Amino acid sequence: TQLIKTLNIHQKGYVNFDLPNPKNGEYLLAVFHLISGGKLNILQAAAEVAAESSTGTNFNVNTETPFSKEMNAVVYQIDLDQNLVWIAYPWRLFDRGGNVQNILTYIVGNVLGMKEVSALKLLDVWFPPAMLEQYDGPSYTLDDMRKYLNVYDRPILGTIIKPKMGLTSAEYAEAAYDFWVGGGDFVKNDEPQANQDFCPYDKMVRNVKAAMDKAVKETGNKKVHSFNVSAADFDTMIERCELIRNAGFEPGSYAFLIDGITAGWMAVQTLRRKYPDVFIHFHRAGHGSFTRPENPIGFSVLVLSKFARLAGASGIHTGTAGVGKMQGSPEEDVVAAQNILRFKDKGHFFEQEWSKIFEGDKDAITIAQADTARHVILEDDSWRGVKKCCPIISGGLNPTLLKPFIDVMGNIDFITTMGAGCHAHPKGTTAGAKALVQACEAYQKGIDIKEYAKTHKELEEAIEFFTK
Amino acid sequence: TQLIKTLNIHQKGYVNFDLPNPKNGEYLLAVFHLISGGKLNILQAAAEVAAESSTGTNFNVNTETPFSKEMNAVVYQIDLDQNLVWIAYPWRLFDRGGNVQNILTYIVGNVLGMKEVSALKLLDVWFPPAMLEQYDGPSYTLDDMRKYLNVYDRPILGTIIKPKMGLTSAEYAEAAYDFWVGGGDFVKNDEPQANQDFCPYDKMVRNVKAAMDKAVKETGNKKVHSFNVSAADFDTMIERCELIRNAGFEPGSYAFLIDGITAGWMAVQTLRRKYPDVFIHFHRAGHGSFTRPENPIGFSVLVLSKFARLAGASGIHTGTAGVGKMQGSPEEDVVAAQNILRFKDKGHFFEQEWSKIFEGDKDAITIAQADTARHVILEDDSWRGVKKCCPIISGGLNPTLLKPFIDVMGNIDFITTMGAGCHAHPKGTTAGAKALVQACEAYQKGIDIKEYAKTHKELEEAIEFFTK
Amino acid sequence: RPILGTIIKPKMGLTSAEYAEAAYDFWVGGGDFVKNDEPQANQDFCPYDKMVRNVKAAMDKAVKETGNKKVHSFNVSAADFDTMIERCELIRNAGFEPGSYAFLIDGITAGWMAVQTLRRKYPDVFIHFHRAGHGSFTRPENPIGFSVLVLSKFARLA
Amino acid sequence: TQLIKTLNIHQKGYVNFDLPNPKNGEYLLAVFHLISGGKLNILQAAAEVAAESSTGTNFNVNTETPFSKEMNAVVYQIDLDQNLVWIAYPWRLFDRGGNVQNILTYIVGNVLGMKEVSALKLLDVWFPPAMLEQYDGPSYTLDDMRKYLNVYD
Ligand SMILES: O=C(O)[C@@](O)(COP(=O)(O)O)[C@H](O)[C@H](O)COP(=O)(O)O
Ligand SMILES: O=C(O)[C@@](O)(COP(=O)(O)O)[C@H](O)[C@H](O)COP(=O)(O)O
Ligand SMILES: [Mg+2]
Ligand SMILES: [Mg+2]
Ligand SMILES: [Mg+2]
Ligand SMILES: [Mg+2]
């Protein structure tokens, strides 16, 4: 009321507390933690943020048409105690053809640089079904990799080949084989692993193909390697992708890892569209400045995961919820993982149903019940909703912390990669992989890891090394 | 000394205070503001940051080869009062072929997410000449656009067509013509301006071509439009680029604008390599979470500008140094602009010469003296050094603030775009452009804007509107 | 007068820009001929294409400044034929003035087949026979081998 | 010691007897039987050979960068009785793409023609695994021909 009266003529055009239905399908919804930078109240700063993020500037321009005002972002709700502002963005503003970076430019672009706000954090977003129809979403999912690996009822066990850099193609392939033949299913390139002169990319791909062939023949179990395809340009990325394709691995045995933050959302969308049959591994390296709680300006991990799911990433790192070495808590990481893995989640502020069909459809209710029961959904009915994005759990994880994270995760529908958790095991990479599989089996059987390690030497050695 | 003794075996491998020559060409140099997250001193947290950013993890992995330890990032200097840590990264770690996002993944990637640090801000970086040889740098520069525009001895005057979104192709072209025929040289797409359904991209390009043709014929002066080519994927971006190319504009009359942060560094490098003859307009929308001083985790504006120059961007927004609406001060913005515009700058912590030749070369000294004298350098001798990256000054700027920013800028070698400074002028876009040109002429003649506006109605109206 | 030439020292370790700068420094100082050192190739710190482009720019600058033509001898010895011809075509499509570039081949290490292939594919290009490794054949301290005269005669025949 | 003190400034950049790990993977190792050709001792001749076979000449050139010194071949060991010199060549010097004749041009190229040495025989070389990854190696082997011929034992 009073804050509305404090608004000038320009700011009033971007504030509508009497918006009749924010969830009518015309508006993406964004909740911002907002603290003004000085001399502006919360509502004035929110109006400036909405103008700078939809259509306007610090002033009313004389070129403003009545049609332009329809595209205005409007503040439709404010919590004064929490400093929360809700903004409805007409998704007509966004670039057509499922352009996610255009959305990020609108909502988490210039507004982060504004001195009018001392804190601007996009906590959550809500995608209407009409807007959700515009975007690709995932095409390859965790269920497809589960089918390829024949891994069900447990998290897909993965590793990151440590050292991060400095190994040759032969050494990297040897480490990948050592993890694979030890029982591990998933091996990923470290995020900066690329065509370095001491580890050439084609040699690395060929050696990884040979190592995976040997591991598959020895264990009788399929294996998956996630190749980092982040390059200087598109041509190098697609050349590396085609090099992986023409190796040639079995279909499903390789995933395309892209550094989403650094390489860009364009690279993620290009990989998703060019290779819909390949698991797109979204690596979120560099996300911290956006998502760290110490940083007042940015967007939450939940928003990043939601936009990664929208962009078509098959999976994205979500965080260990403070169990690992990455910041910082379960309330962000587990919530984001549930939101990207579930057909419907809470989440932080918006009830996000990833269905693209009518709200009260009986088939939608059946799909939600099946998704809650952990059955595969959207296989023959992919039009109904967005496919799930697989959470990927990494960062300072050893087998001893496998059970606690699941205790925070609430489920086992995720890929877990442990670089130092296995390669820093005193008895080698294969011993670390065996210890990880032993910890997973102990969790599956309900046996405590200390009790389980009495008959499993690798698990006991991992507990002894990783407890100090 | 004591902090070195506090280090364990793993951390000692990433700390070398006795590094004999950090500037030997083997190491990129990075200065980090670092505050530990808890239970770790400054040296321990710096060692973890260096390990996580070069080769290692929280532990020593048994796969580590002696060759791997050579690629270790080493902390070679620490200021305890300022909480500053210097890390030398062997640039052998970085992906070959001039991949900049690989560098960003190494140095400002995973380390931002580490809970071991409560503050981690990359304040500055230093590129050795041997490393600088590996990267493209700019190919089209501000000097080429100055030659095309026939604009010398004053900043290139530019505008952003406000409203940011909501105008049709005809209205946008009309606003661009109104600025161009008013004396303004440069018109840019707003950062999210793309193929929206109400402003189709091909229609916008054709209408902008017609408007620029009309403005060029009426004024007898060439004009430049910067088109936003940020798309969902590479194919859409190149389709829009080719659409601009086959419009067909005069060569030099169009620039390719890319949202570098959101669309990604891969898009910037791809635009640089595919179109070296086109001004690559780096728009840094979303940079704030990286660069805002309120955010303890990220990298400085200077580092972003330096990496944009390395990636081949012809120009990048640098900030109004607190004069405009964007945060927040001259010490970051002006320093970054000088570092990307000069052949050699201070800068924050490293003396960065952008020459790729011997440090004491007489020709290098002559080139530096010519660059200080504002002569065009590196035309016939582009091997010698990296071409300058033009600073672009935008954000809450009206003509009344044109003189003060130059007072902080120390030069007029920049493109200045004013969206609300001209389109919010009460007498229209052409009146705003005339007021901006009048303010520029008043600065060039030393006449105060209040004195100059007595014989120039547009400048007086702009002052009256923008002084309150 | 003899054609004045130089070899860019250091032999290795210079970037493409530093190499082109040294070549320009010799060229603008009155020197006519600049050659790749015999192992100078597509090293990671001095990429071959960047070296060729920078040498082309430096030769252009020296030619305009001095008003005299300049010649650079590029080492085209590679691992295989395909790499050698790729480097040769990279030199040709730089594109230098015809006669301003010579092809340097390590005739002993790379082999006589490389020398003959360079001669037959590029008869209009000066074939620079570098004889690195010849000493074991030609050193007087070595009782087994062949004289320098024999090596020169077979080079001229090839 | 005394041979180290006999060296000049130029030769000292190609002699490092305190090389910490010659087998760290950065260096191809070469052992040379070396007898100097007159007025140079074993260490000076070895330094000249290392300079001529990695980056240097008979003098210090003014174009030498600090990066260039990182590519210097260094004599890291000497057997005075056997006239043996160990030189660590950073394999960064070698042409990329598995170029073997480039390696031979470096190590057994110009140095054979030097008059500063009266005997220069490369007895042995050691390839680090990181260097060995760069090169092809045999693809068809004696085992393949044994399988084709059905000839074993
Ligand atoms: O390099 C690394 O740090 C990791 O490989 C983990 O290594 P360790 O498991 O051996 O520690 C992961 O890439 C990061 O955890 C990603 O972070 P996030 O999951 O938060 O996106
Ligand atoms: O939408 C905007 O906010 C602007 O068009 C400025 O508009 P006005 O000039 O009309 O205010 C610019 O894109 C930002 O300033 C970029 O910020 P930076 O220069 O810091 O990268
Ligand atoms: Mg990693
Ligand atoms: Mg139904
Ligand atoms: Mg010079
Ligand atoms: Mg030579």
Side-chain angles (χ1 to χ4, degrees):
Chain A
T1 6
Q2 307 168 320
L3 295 170
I4 306 187
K5 313 217 260 304
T6 66
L7 294 182
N8 48 47
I9 287 324
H10 162 69
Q11 294 162 335
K12 232 91 71 61
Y14 296 92
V15 175
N16 186 10
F17 285 123
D18 311 321
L19 193 56
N21 190 6
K23 295 183 127 60
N24 64 0
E26 282 187 313
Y27 308 97
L28 170 146
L29 296 189
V31 55
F32 282 97
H33 179 252
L34 198 154
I35 297 161
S36 83
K39 292 200 176 183
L40 260 60
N41 51 60
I42 178 62
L43 186 53
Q44 296 177 312
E48 313 283 20
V49 165
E52 188 45 49
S53 35
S54 66
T55 57
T57 323
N58 44 359
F59 294 106
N60 292 125
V61 286
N62 72 86
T63 34
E64 174 190 64
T65 70
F67 185 85
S68 222
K69 309 213 236 269
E70 304 314 314
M71 306 282 83
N72 284 11
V74 284
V75 172
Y76 68 92
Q77 182 174 306
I78 58 168
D79 195 337
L80 278 310
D81 297 315
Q82 297 195 260
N83 285 268
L84 302 168
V85 295
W86 285 256
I87 304 180
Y89 295 84
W91 61 262
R92 206 138 167 225
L93 292 158
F94 306 138
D95 179 43
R96 285 321 173 119
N99 189 349
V100 169
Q101 69 76 237
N102 179 272
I103 313 156
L104 297 194
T105 310
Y106 271 112
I107 69 186
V108 288
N110 276 357
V111 289
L112 309 184
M114 289 162 56
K115 64 147 161 216
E116 295 99 305
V117 295
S118 72
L120 187 58
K121 200 95 153 175
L122 181 65
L123 299 185
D124 201 1
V125 296
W126 183 81
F127 308 127
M131 190 188 155
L132 283 174
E133 180 85 71
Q134 297 285 309
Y135 294 87
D136 291 8
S139 50
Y140 197 99
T141 67
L142 173 62
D143 298 350
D144 305 303
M145 219 180 69
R146 269 191 193 286
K147 188 178 175 196
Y148 182 76
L149 295 172
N150 225 286
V151 170
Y152 307 92
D153 310 309
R154 61 176 189 77
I156 283 163
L157 297 186
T159 199
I160 313 126
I161 304 305
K162 302 309 165 169
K164 161 193 320 293
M165 192 55 33
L167 292 187
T168 73
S169 291
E171 270 135 7
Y172 177 81
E174 181 66 29
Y177 166 81
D178 285 0
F179 180 74
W180 274 329
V181 86
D185 330 295
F186 185 87
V187 172
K188 65 180 297 300
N189 277 144
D190 222 318
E191 71 279 321
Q193 180 150 5
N195 186 51
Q196 279 89 14
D197 76 271
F198 50 85
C199 50
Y201 196 83
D202 54 322
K203 302 214 192 76
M204 182 267 286
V205 165
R206 289 194 317 261
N207 295 354
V208 165
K209 194 266 178 77
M212 178 194 276
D213 282 351
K214 190 171 198 351
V216 169
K217 309 326 141 69
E218 295 214 46
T219 68
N221 293 315
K222 296 271 182 15
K223 312 297 180 158
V224 178
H225 189 277
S226 193
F227 289 106
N228 171 38
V229 294
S230 342
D233 47 63
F234 163 91
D235 279 347
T236 305
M237 168 174 86
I238 295 300
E239 145 173 70
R240 301 191 176 153
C241 280
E242 292 300 82
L243 201 68
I244 288 139
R245 310 258 280 173
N246 310 334
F249 292 78
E250 273 196 26
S253 69
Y254 60 94
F256 289 162
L257 192 146
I258 182 69
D259 313 335
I261 299 323
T262 56
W265 288 91
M266 274 179 73
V268 172
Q269 293 199 247
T270 288
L271 288 178
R272 156 70 185 69
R273 292 171 179 199
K274 295 254 141 70
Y275 310 100
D277 55 321
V278 184
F279 194 93
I280 311 297
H281 191 153
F282 197 109
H283 198 287
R284 68 185 186 164
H287 78 104
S289 307
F290 292 122
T291 69
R292 282 290 289 267
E294 303 90 340
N295 273 14
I297 291 159
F299 50 83
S300 64
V301 162
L302 165 61
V303 162
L304 160 60
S305 318
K306 293 186 62 147
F307 275 108
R309 179 174 182 173
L310 193 73
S314 310
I316 184 177
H317 293 248
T318 33
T320 54
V323 190
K325 82 186 184 248
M326 295 304 210
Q327 169 92 233
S329 114
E331 284 81 340
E332 309 270 53
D333 304 22
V334 167
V335 164
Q338 272 150 341
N339 271 276
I340 53 146
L341 185 75
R342 275 163 193 193
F343 189 68
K344 174 202 210 127
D345 211 36
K346 177 165 150 148
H348 276 344
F349 298 91
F350 302 122
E351 232 291 334
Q352 182 65 82
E353 302 165 0
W354 293 83
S355 145
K356 295 173 275 207
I357 59 173
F358 202 40
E359 144 157 277
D361 208 79
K362 316 298 193 65
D363 291 300
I365 284 142
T366 291
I367 288 186
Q369 266 144 35
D371 171 74
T372 287
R374 269 161 30 72
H375 303 147
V376 180
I377 62 160
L378 297 174
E379 208 60 276
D380 59 349
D381 45 348
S382 58
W383 79 89
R384 296 214 157 119
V386 190
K387 276 158 182 320
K388 71 222 294 198
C389 193
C390 178
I392 302 161
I393 316 306
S394 325
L397 283 185
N398 49 81
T400 297
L401 305 162
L402 175 52
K403 162 140 171 53
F405 169 74
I406 310 179
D407 295 346
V408 184
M409 182 47 116
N411 61 78
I412 45 87
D413 307 77
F414 57 93
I415 305 161
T416 170
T417 61
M418 326 212 167
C422 292
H423 295 270
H425 192 290
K427 292 329 171 54
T429 293
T430 313
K434 257 184 206 102
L436 180 64
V437 182
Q438 280 156 30
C440 188
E441 271 284 33
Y443 191 86
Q444 184 65 10
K445 309 168 152 162
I447 302 166
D448 185 59
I449 39 124
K450 289 195 188 165
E451 294 304 305
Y452 204 65
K454 298 178 144 105
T455 46
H456 297 89
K457 188 56 189 135
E458 290 89 8
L459 182 53
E460 173 55 72
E461 299 170 299
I463 298 166
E464 197 139 5
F465 181 77
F466 284 119
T467 41
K468 267 198 194 165
Chain B
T1 7
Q2 298 162 326
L3 295 170
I4 301 172
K5 306 210 262 305
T6 73
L7 298 174
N8 48 48
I9 288 325
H10 163 68
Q11 295 162 334
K12 232 92 71 61
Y14 296 92
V15 174
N16 188 6
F17 286 122
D18 295 346
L19 196 57
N21 184 8
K23 300 177 127 61
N24 64 357
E26 282 189 312
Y27 309 96
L28 170 146
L29 297 188
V31 55
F32 283 97
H33 181 249
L34 197 153
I35 295 161
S36 82
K39 302 209 174 214
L40 259 60
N41 51 61
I42 177 69
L43 196 45
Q44 284 174 320
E48 314 285 16
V49 164
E52 185 49 50
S53 34
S54 71
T55 57
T57 323
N58 42 359
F59 299 97
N60 293 123
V61 279
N62 73 84
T63 35
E64 163 195 68
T65 68
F67 185 85
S68 222
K69 311 213 240 264
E70 304 314 313
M71 307 282 83
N72 284 11
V74 284
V75 172
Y76 68 93
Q77 181 173 307
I78 55 161
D79 195 337
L80 278 303
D81 296 316
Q82 297 194 259
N83 286 279
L84 302 169
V85 295
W86 285 256
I87 304 181
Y89 295 84
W91 62 261
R92 207 137 166 225
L93 292 157
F94 306 138
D95 177 47
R96 285 323 175 117
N99 185 352
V100 160
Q101 66 78 237
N102 179 272
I103 315 157
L104 297 195
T105 310
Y106 272 112
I107 68 189
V108 289
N110 272 352
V111 290
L112 309 184
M114 289 162 58
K115 66 149 146 202
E116 292 94 312
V117 294
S118 72
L120 188 59
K121 198 90 144 177
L122 181 65
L123 299 185
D124 201 1
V125 296
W126 183 82
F127 310 126
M131 191 188 156
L132 283 174
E133 179 84 72
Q134 300 281 311
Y135 294 88
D136 293 4
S139 54
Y140 197 99
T141 67
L142 173 61
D143 297 350
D144 306 303
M145 215 183 70
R146 269 191 192 287
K147 186 179 171 196
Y148 182 77
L149 290 189
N150 224 286
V151 170
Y152 307 93
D153 310 307
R154 64 168 182 76
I156 283 163
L157 298 186
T159 197
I160 318 109
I161 304 304
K162 302 309 166 168
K164 162 195 321 294
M165 195 51 36
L167 290 187
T168 72
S169 290
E171 272 133 17
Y172 176 82
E174 179 67 28
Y177 165 82
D178 284 1
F179 180 75
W180 274 329
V181 85
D185 330 295
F186 186 87
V187 172
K188 65 180 294 292
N189 276 145
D190 220 318
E191 71 276 317
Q193 181 148 3
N195 184 45
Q196 280 88 14
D197 77 276
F198 50 85
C199 50
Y201 197 82
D202 60 329
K203 298 207 195 83
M204 182 267 287
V205 165
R206 289 195 317 261
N207 295 354
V208 163
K209 196 267 175 76
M212 176 194 276
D213 275 352
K214 187 173 199 353
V216 169
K217 309 327 142 66
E218 296 211 47
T219 66
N221 293 316
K222 296 278 189 14
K223 311 296 178 156
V224 178
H225 188 276
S226 194
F227 292 101
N228 176 33
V229 294
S230 347
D233 47 62
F234 162 90
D235 270 329
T236 306
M237 167 174 85
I238 295 299
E239 145 174 70
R240 302 190 175 159
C241 278
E242 294 297 89
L243 201 69
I244 289 139
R245 301 258 283 176
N246 313 330
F249 292 78
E250 276 201 27
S253 68
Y254 59 94
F256 290 159
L257 192 146
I258 182 69
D259 313 335
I261 299 323
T262 56
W265 288 91
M266 274 178 73
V268 176
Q269 295 201 246
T270 289
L271 290 177
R272 166 55 191 69
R273 292 170 179 199
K274 296 251 142 69
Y275 309 102
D277 54 323
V278 183
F279 194 93
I280 311 297
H281 191 153
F282 197 110
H283 198 291
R284 66 184 188 166
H287 78 104
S289 302
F290 291 123
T291 69
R292 281 290 289 267
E294 302 89 341
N295 274 15
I297 294 163
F299 50 83
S300 65
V301 162
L302 164 61
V303 161
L304 167 47
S305 317
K306 293 188 59 159
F307 275 108
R309 182 168 176 182
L310 200 68
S314 310
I316 187 176
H317 292 249
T318 41
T320 57
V323 189
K325 79 180 181 243
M326 294 306 209
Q327 164 90 229
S329 112
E331 285 83 346
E332 313 273 41
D333 299 27
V334 170
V335 163
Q338 270 148 349
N339 270 274
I340 53 146
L341 185 76
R342 271 160 197 194
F343 184 70
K344 167 198 209 133
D345 211 35
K346 176 169 155 144
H348 276 345
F349 299 91
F350 302 121
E351 232 292 333
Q352 182 68 82
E353 288 142 19
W354 292 83
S355 143
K356 295 172 274 206
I357 59 173
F358 203 39
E359 135 161 283
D361 210 82
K362 311 304 186 65
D363 291 299
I365 284 143
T366 291
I367 286 184
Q369 266 144 35
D371 171 73
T372 287
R374 269 161 30 72
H375 303 147
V376 180
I377 62 160
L378 296 173
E379 209 63 273
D380 53 356
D381 46 348
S382 61
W383 78 88
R384 291 204 163 125
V386 189
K387 275 159 183 319
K388 72 221 294 197
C389 187
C390 175
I392 302 149
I393 316 304
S394 325
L397 280 204
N398 44 84
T400 297
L401 308 160
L402 176 52
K403 162 140 172 53
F405 169 73
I406 310 180
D407 286 337
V408 185
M409 182 47 115
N411 61 78
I412 45 87
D413 308 76
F414 58 92
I415 305 162
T416 174
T417 63
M418 324 211 168
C422 288
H423 296 271
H425 195 289
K427 293 329 171 56
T429 291
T430 313
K434 257 184 206 102
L436 180 64
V437 181
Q438 281 156 30
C440 188
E441 269 287 35
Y443 191 85
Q444 180 68 14
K445 308 166 149 163
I447 294 153
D448 180 60
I449 37 128
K450 291 195 187 166
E451 292 309 307
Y452 203 67
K454 299 178 143 106
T455 47
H456 296 88
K457 188 50 185 139
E458 289 87 0
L459 180 52
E460 172 55 70
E461 301 168 301
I463 296 166
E464 197 145 6
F465 183 71
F466 286 119
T467 41
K468 267 197 194 165
Chain C
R1 60 173 188 77
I3 283 170
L4 298 186
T6 197
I7 310 136
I8 296 313
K9 301 309 165 170
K11 162 193 323 291
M12 200 54 33
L14 292 189
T15 71
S16 294
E18 275 136 7
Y19 180 78
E21 180 68 40
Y24 166 79
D25 284 0
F26 181 75
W27 275 329
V28 86
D32 327 283
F33 187 85
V34 175
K35 63 179 297 298
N36 273 157
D37 218 314
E38 72 279 325
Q40 171 149 17
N42 185 50
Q43 277 93 4
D44 79 88
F45 48 85
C46 52
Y48 193 85
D49 55 320
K50 301 216 196 76
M51 188 266 291
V52 176
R53 302 209 301 276
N54 295 353
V55 160
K56 194 267 179 78
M59 183 196 279
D60 284 352
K61 190 174 195 351
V63 165
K64 321 307 137 81
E65 280 198 41
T66 57
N68 294 315
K69 292 272 183 16
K70 308 294 171 165
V71 175
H72 190 277
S73 191
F74 292 101
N75 173 46
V76 297
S77 345
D80 51 65
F81 162 91
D82 281 352
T83 310
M84 169 174 83
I85 293 300
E86 145 173 73
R87 308 196 167 155
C88 285
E89 292 301 83
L90 201 69
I91 289 144
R92 312 256 280 169
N93 310 336
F96 290 77
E97 274 200 27
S100 60
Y101 60 92
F103 288 159
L104 194 144
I105 187 70
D106 308 320
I108 300 318
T109 56
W112 286 87
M113 280 180 72
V115 172
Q116 292 201 246
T117 287
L118 290 178
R119 158 69 181 71
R120 294 172 178 198
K121 301 235 153 254
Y122 310 102
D124 54 318
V125 188
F126 193 94
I127 310 300
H128 192 151
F129 194 109
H130 202 281
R131 68 187 188 163
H134 78 111
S136 307
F137 296 119
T138 61
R139 282 291 291 260
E141 304 90 341
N142 272 13
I144 293 165
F146 50 82
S147 65
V148 170
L149 165 60
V150 166
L151 169 51
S152 323
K153 289 188 68 158
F154 280 105
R156 172 185 195 167
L157 191 72
Chain D
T1 5
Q2 304 171 322
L3 297 167
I4 307 184
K5 311 215 263 305
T6 56
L7 297 174
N8 51 46
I9 290 322
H10 160 65
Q11 294 158 338
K12 200 88 47 54
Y14 296 93
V15 175
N16 191 6
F17 286 123
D18 311 320
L19 192 57
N21 187 6
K23 295 181 126 60
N24 59 4
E26 286 197 297
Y27 306 106
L28 174 147
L29 299 186
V31 53
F32 286 93
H33 180 251
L34 198 155
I35 298 161
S36 85
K39 299 201 173 180
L40 260 64
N41 47 63
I42 180 62
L43 192 47
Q44 301 170 314
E48 308 287 18
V49 162
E52 185 44 53
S53 37
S54 61
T55 57
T57 318
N58 50 359
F59 290 109
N60 291 127
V61 286
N62 76 88
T63 32
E64 173 187 61
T65 67
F67 188 84
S68 205
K69 309 215 234 268
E70 302 314 313
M71 306 284 86
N72 283 9
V74 281
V75 178
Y76 67 94
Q77 186 182 308
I78 47 157
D79 197 335
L80 279 314
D81 292 316
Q82 298 196 257
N83 285 265
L84 290 185
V85 298
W86 287 256
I87 303 181
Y89 295 85
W91 63 263
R92 207 134 169 230
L93 299 149
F94 305 141
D95 179 36
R96 286 320 175 119
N99 192 351
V100 165
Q101 63 70 33
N102 179 271
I103 308 147
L104 298 188
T105 304
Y106 275 109
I107 69 193
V108 285
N110 277 353
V111 292
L112 311 181
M114 288 163 54
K115 66 146 160 215
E116 295 102 305
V117 297
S118 74
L120 190 55
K121 201 96 153 169
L122 179 66
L123 301 185
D124 204 359
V125 298
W126 180 81
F127 307 127
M131 191 188 153
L132 280 172
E133 177 87 75
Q134 298 287 307
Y135 296 86
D136 297 8
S139 49
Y140 197 98
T141 69
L142 174 62
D143 297 344
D144 300 302
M145 215 184 66
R146 269 190 192 288
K147 186 173 164 201
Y148 181 77
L149 294 169
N150 225 287
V151 170
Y152 306 98
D153 310 308

